[PDB]
């Protein structure tokens, strides 16, 4: 699709066998979404923001449709004011920006 | 142009006579900037994100020209870690995410 941004360019995502909604955000390095079980072992990371820096739990390699494409890769979870959807998984989707 | 999302998609814009780099961010509903003077009447605003809110001043009917194209909108400044070109005026370039 072209997803044009006069409104928040909000999409479901599936994860878990959940749907979710979720902002595509490339402003963001990073896919951090909030509080859910995940599998497996998650590492530390901090992710900074506008507000300061967070901690939070990163899992590798967990598959994700998002706007119904496949993704497999990093989702960090956290306090973060809204899902995000950032560019490690964006790159999956073959996402790009245009003017 | 087409910019891809492996690294950051930033760009060069011209505020207040001012060179700046910015990040051009489909996340953000708002525009934001590092300490710097805009001409005319502002106000008080709180803005949130991944580790919480900033107070920032709000001014209205700036231009910025990004990467080429120039903008007129709302324009905050306060004190964000990077200078962001949020929706209200990655619209009037044209800028679409695509994938
Ligand atoms: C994975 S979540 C963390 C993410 N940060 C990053 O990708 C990169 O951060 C940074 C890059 C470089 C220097 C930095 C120094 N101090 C902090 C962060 C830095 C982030 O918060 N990105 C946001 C933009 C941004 C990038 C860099 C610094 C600060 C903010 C996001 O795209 C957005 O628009 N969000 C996410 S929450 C809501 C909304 C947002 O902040 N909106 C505004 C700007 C408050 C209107």
Same mark, same amino acid.
């Given at each position: 699709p072209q997803i044009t941004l006069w409104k928040r360019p909000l999409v479901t995502i599936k994860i878990? /066998?959940?749907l979710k909604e979720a902002l595509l955000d490339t402003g963001a390095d990073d896919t951090? =979404?909030?509080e859910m079980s995940l599998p497996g072992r998650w590492?530390?990371?901090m992710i900074g /923001? =506008?507000?300061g820096f967070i901690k939070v739990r990163q899992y590798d390699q967990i598959i994700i449709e998002?706007? /119904?494409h496949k993704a497999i890769g990093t989702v960090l979870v956290g306090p973060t004011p809204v899902n995000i959807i950032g560019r490690n998984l964006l790159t999956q989707i073959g996402?790009?920006?245009n003017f």
């Amino acid at each position: 699709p072209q997803i044009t941004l006069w409104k928040r360019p909000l999409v479901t995502i599936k994860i878990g /066998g959940q749907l979710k909604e979720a902002l595509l955000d490339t402003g963001a390095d990073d896919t951090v =979404i909030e509080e859910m079980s995940l599998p497996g072992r998650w590492k530390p990371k901090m992710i900074g /923001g =506008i507000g300061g820096f967070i901690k939070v739990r990163q899992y590798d390699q967990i598959i994700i449709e998002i706007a /119904g494409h496949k993704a497999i890769g990093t989702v960090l979870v956290g306090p973060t004011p809204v899902n995000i959807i950032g560019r490690n998984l964006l790159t999956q989707i073959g996402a790009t920006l245009n003017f």
